[PDB]
C-alpha cells in the first residue's frame, strides 16, 4: 500500500455517533434520553437488576448448594482427539501438553469415549471412563492410571 | 547489515534516503519508501529473522 492511498477494509471502521448536535441528526436536544424522568438525568438510572422496589428475582429465589474444598476437576480428552496419534504411540500428559491438545491439565487427564478410536495406543492418564477403557483396549491398546 | 557504520553514516543525511539495519525493519519504513535498496547480507539476515 501507499501512505497516500490507504483504504480500510469495508465495514472495518465506523463513524462515532455524537449526540446533542442539532435536531436533524436525530439526537439533538434530548440526546436520545427522552423527556424528564430518572433515566434522563446525568448519571441517572437504577442499579442493575433493580425492579423499582418489587422484590428482585434473586431475593425471591433461595440460595443452594456449596463448594467442595477438595473439588477435583479433570481435563477431558476424547477418542477423536486420540485418533490424531500414530499406532504404537505412548500417549502421556506430557505428550498431550506438547501437542497442545491439553494446555491446562487441572487435576489430571481423564479420557472419555465420545468418538470412535481407530489406532492402537498405550494411554496414560489420571482417569478413564469405563467406555473409554473398553474402546482403547478393544482397539488393541492399553490404559495405565498414572 | 549490522556494523556497516560507514555506509550508514554516508547515506543518512541524504534527503530521500532512510537507513535501517536488517534486524530493525518495520512495516512503516518499507511502505514509506518507494524503493528498497538492500545489501545481500541484509537480505539473508532478514530471511532469517522472518
Amino acid at each position: 500500500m501507499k501512505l497516500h492511498e490507504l483504504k480500510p477494509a469495508e465495514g472495518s471502521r465506523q463513524v462515532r455517533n455524537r449526540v446533542g448536535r442539532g435536531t436533524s441528526s436525530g439526537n439533538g436536544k434530548t440526546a436520545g434520553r427522552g423527556q424528564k424522568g430518572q433515566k434522563a438525568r446525568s448519571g441517572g438510572g437504577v442499579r442493575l437488576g433493580f425492579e423499582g422496589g418489587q422484590t428482585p428475582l434473586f431475593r425471591r429465589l433461595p440460595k443452594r448448594g456449596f463448594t467442595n474444598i477438595n473439588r477435583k476437576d479433570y481435563a477431558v480428552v476424547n477418542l477423536d482427539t486420540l485418533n490424531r496419534f500414530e499406532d504404537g504411540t505412548e500417549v502421556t500428559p506430557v505428550v498431550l501438553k506438547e501437542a497442545g491438545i491439553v494446555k491446562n491439565e487441572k487435576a489430571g487427564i481423564k479420557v472419555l469415549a465420545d468418538g470412535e478410536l481407530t489406532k492402537k495406543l498405550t494411554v496414560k492418564a489420571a482417569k478413564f471412563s469405563k467406555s473409554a477403557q473398553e474402546a482403547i483396549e478393544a482397539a488393541g491398546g492399553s490404559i495405565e492410571v498414572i | 547489515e549490522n556494523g556497516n557504520d560507514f555506509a550508514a553514516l554516508s547515506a543518512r543525511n541524504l534527503p530521500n534516503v532512510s537507513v535501517v539495519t536488517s534486524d530493525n525493519v518495520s512495516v512503516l519504513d518499507v511502505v514509506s519508501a518507494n524503493k528498497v535498496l538492500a545489501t545481500q547480507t541484509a537480505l539473508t539476515q532478514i530471511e532469517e529473522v522472518l
Binding site: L48, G49, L57, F58, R59, R60, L61, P62 | -
Partner: protein, 64 residues
C-alpha cells in the same frame, strides 16, 4: 475496574450448557401445610430463568 459479579445471584443460579441459567423454586422454605402435595412435588423440581428476567440480569453474571 473489573465488573463485579452479583454474589447473591451467584449463590442462587447455575450456568447451563446452552447458556441458560438454572434456578431453584420459590415457596420451598416453610408453610408447607398451605400447599398441596402436588405443589410441593412440582416445586421440588428446578427451573430456568425466564427470558425477561435474564435480559435484566445477564450483565451481573457475565463472569460468574
Amino acid at each position: 475496574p473489573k465488573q463485579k459479579t452479583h454474589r447473591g445471584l451467584a449463590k442462587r443460579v447455575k450456568r447451563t450448557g446452552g447458556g441458560g441459567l438454572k434456578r431453584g423454586r420459590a415457596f420451598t422454605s416453610h408453610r408447607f401445610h398451605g400447599k398441596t402435595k402436588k405443589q410441593r412435588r412440582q416445586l421440588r423440581k428446578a427451573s430456568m430463568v425466564a427470558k425477561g428476567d435474564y435480559k435484566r440480569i445477564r450483565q451481573q453474571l457475565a463472569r460468574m
